[PDB]
Design a protein around this motif. Structure first.
Motif, PDB file in Angstrom:
ATOM      1  N   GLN A   1       3.752  11.844  15.600  1.00 27.12           N
ATOM      2  CA  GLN A   1       3.084  12.953  14.910  1.00 27.12           C
ATOM      3  C   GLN A   1       2.231  12.461  13.750  1.00 27.12           C
ATOM      4  O   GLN A   1       1.106  12.928  13.558  1.00 27.12           O
ATOM      5  N   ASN A   2       2.780  11.524  12.981  1.00 25.02           N
ATOM      6  CA  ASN A   2       2.070  10.924  11.861  1.00 25.02           C
ATOM      7  C   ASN A   2       0.857  10.103  12.322  1.00 25.02           C
ATOM      8  O   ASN A   2      -0.168  10.069  11.640  1.00 25.02           O
TER       9      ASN A   2
ATOM     10  N   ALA B   1      -1.978  12.535  13.240  1.00 25.80           N
ATOM     11  CA  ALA B   1      -2.489  13.100  11.990  1.00 25.80           C
ATOM     12  C   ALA B   1      -3.465  12.145  11.294  1.00 25.80           C
ATOM     13  O   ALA B   1      -4.501  12.577  10.777  1.00 25.80           O
TER      14      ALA B   1
END
Length: 242
Positions: free
Chosen positions: A213-214, A217
């Protein structure tokens, strides 16, 4: 018969099935030596060539076992064929038994993910040269001054140093946001001319989705400027070494 193909070494027994086909469609089995499970299959050749198909097959065997729950392993590099188990005796393994127990202890529950970063080198080179007027004037006037080879290289060293900082601005965003999620981060040399970063991370297996997820992003912070290749499943080749 001809030999045994070795895929990897495990700290725990691998159950009977777990049914899996491997190199040349042969079934994949497990053999215990010093409390270590050697994942293997029967070889058809003594010497296997590293073709794309065969490499993919090797990796698929390891990943299928990993997705079956057997996540802790020392993956063996491609094309290792032994004739009999006499090549891997209890006598040969007993000295390295401690080092192995130790490696599997820091590996257990952990997972290797890797990130590679690419960019347009020519664009980023030309952008760095127009952010520094000093270097462009020295580079154009370096002929006429008749420089020795050291002074010539020193100018080239100053041209790359501004490009180095452009990379360090990008790379530092990754270190700030991702290194703290990891137990160990190894950084390697870029393999191609557009590659500027080649890092591997040892993270707990369950923390992968947050890590992924990071990554997306960050891949969203930078636009089309960067081309980020993130790999969340591979045998732990970078970390699983003595």
């Amino acid at each position: 018969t001809v030999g045994l193909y070795l895929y990897g070494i495990f700290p725990e027994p691998i159950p009977d099935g777990l049914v899996l086909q491997g190199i040349d469609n042969e079934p994949v089995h497990s053999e215990m030596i010093d409390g270590f499970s050697f994942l293997y299959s029967a070889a058809h050749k003594e010497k296997y060539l590293a073709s794309r198909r065969y490499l993919i097959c090797h990796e698929k065997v390891l990943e299928t076992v990993m997705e079956a729950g057997f996540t802790t392993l020392l993956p063996l590099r491609f094309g290792l064929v032994i004739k009999t188990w006499e090549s891997v005796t209890e006598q040969l393994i007993t000295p390295y038994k401690t080092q192995l127990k130790e490696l599997f202890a820091k590996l257990s529950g952990q997972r290797e993910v890797s990130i590679k970063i690419f960019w347009d080198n020519q664009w980023e080179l030309q952008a760095a040269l127009e952010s520094n007027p000093k270097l462009k004037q020295e580079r154009d006037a370096m002929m006429g001054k008749n420089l020795n080879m050291e002074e010539i290289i020193h100018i080239g060293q100053l041209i790359e140093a501004t490009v180095l900082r452009r990379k360090q601005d990008i790379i530092q965003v990754f270190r700030d946001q991702l290194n703290h999620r990891a137990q160990e981060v190894i950084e390697s040399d870029p393999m191609t001319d557009d590659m500027i970063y080649n890092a591997a991370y040892l993270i707990p297996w369950e923390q992968e989705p947050e890590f992924s997820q990071n990554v997306e992003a960050i891949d969203q912070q930078f636009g089309d400027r960067l081309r980020i290749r993130y790999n969340n499943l591979t045998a732990p080749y970078t970390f699983a070494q003595l």
